[PDB]
Amino acid sequence: STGSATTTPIDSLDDAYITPVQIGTPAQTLNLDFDTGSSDLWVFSSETTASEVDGQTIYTPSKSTTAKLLSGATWSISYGDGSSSSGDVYTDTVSVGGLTVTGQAVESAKKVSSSFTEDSTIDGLLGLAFSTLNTVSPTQQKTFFDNAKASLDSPVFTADLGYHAPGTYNFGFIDTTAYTGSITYTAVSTKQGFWEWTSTGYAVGSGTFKSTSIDGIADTGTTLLYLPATVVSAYWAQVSGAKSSSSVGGYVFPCSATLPSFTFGVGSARIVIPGDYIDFGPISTGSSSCFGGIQSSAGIGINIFGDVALKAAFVVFNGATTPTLGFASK
Numbered sequence: 001s002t003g004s005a006t007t008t009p010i011d012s013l014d015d016a017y018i019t020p021v022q023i024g025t026p027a028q029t030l031n032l033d034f035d036t037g038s039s040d041l042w043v044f045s046s047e048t049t050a051s052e053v054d055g056q057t058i059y060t061p062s063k064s065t066t067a068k069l070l071s072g073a074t075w076s077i078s079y080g081d082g083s084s085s086s087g088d089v090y091t092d093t094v095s096v097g098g099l100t101v102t103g104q105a106v107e108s109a110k111k112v113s114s115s116f117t118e119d120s121t122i123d124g125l126l127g128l129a130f131s132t133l134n135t136v137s138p139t140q141q142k143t144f145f146d147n148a149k150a151s152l153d154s155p156v157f158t159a160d161l162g163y164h165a166p167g168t169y170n171f172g173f174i175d176t177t178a179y180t181g182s183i184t185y186t187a188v189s190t191k192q193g194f195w196e197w198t199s200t201g202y203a204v205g206s207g208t209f210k211s212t213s214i215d216g217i218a219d220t221g222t223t224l225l226y227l228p229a230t231v232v233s234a235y236w237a238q239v240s241g242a243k244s245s246s247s248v249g250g251y252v253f254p255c256s257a258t259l260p261s262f263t264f265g266v267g268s269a270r271i272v273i274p275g276d277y278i279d280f281g282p283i284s285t286g287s288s289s290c291f292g293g294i295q296s297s298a299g300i301g302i303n304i305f306g307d308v309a310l311k312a313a314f315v316v317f318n319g320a321t322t323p324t325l326g327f328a329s330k
């Protein structure tokens with residue numbers, strides 16, 4: 001089997017991407033945020049505290065003939081941006097792009113934090129990191145990909161995120177028409193539950209390539225590119241007027257400035273992030289100060305290849321017995 005679904009930015013800045021997901025019988029279609037940095041599939045639901053729901057589409061398990069309470073199960077998750085959600089669990093049929101899993105753990109939110117309430121476009125998350133990060137207790141549950149894996153033609157999924165445009169998640173196959181050149185594969189550590197790998201270095205604009213190991217995660221659920229402070233300083237030093245602002249919480253620049261590209265290494269291969277990808281617009285409406293898409297990972301504890309980086313590439317998440325990551329230009 002295979003599946004193929006279109007993923008769509010939620011706003012004009014590509015702050016996140018939503019993918020339609022069919023849950024239950026008859027199908028309830030929810031728009032979920034596919035997140036290779038977490039491992040819970042959770043949704044706004046009929047059980048979510050009423051005051052915390054504002055425009056989201058909800059899953060109602062009582063209306064699904066295939067929904068079964070996972071008795072005694074609870075879940076509770078906190079994300080890197082300080083947001084959080086929690087609730088109980090049902091198993092139900094879940095389909096993505098024609099690929100169907102039965103008995104998928106669907107985590108029903110009883111509580112979500114303010115940032116989820118305030119974003120009407122995201123109806124929940126679909127985690128695609130390793131199942132060892134799943135928060136369901138007392139019995140940890142498997143991700144959609146983990147459950148689908150044995151049935152897939154090939155044990156892989158791919159992320160092809162668009163720049164200010166729709167893209168694609170495929171399951172079970174590699175679309176050889178979706179990238180240029182070759183796919184370069186690189187080693188993955190699963191020890192922290194993430195798609196964790198080591199970049200071979202970077203360059204800024206037309207600058208020479210600095211060979212240096214940068215350990216980080218491929219994380220579709222994170223908007224920006226977070227790298228060591230040395231690397232980020234070297235990037236913004238090439239942008240006239242750029243400054244790190246403690247009041248804003250990162251690097252900002254005048255948008256009258258032209259942004260250089262940023263290149264990262266994948267083995268001997270190179271992925272080039274165009275300068276325009278690194279522009280996240282005015283810090284507040286009407287402001288001439290724009291927020292940077294490359295920020296310091298200092299204090300996060302880990303480097304994060306988020307959407308800014310991944311949308312410059314065709315990315316293979318290879319879930320073979322020994323997992324690997326593949327990157328191609330496109």
Ligand SMILES: Cc1cccc(C(=O)NN)c1
Pocket residue numbers: 035036037038078079080217219220221222302304
């Ligand atoms: C590195 C890290 C730490 C905490 C949460 C996340 C996550 O959920 N990413 N989408 C990632």
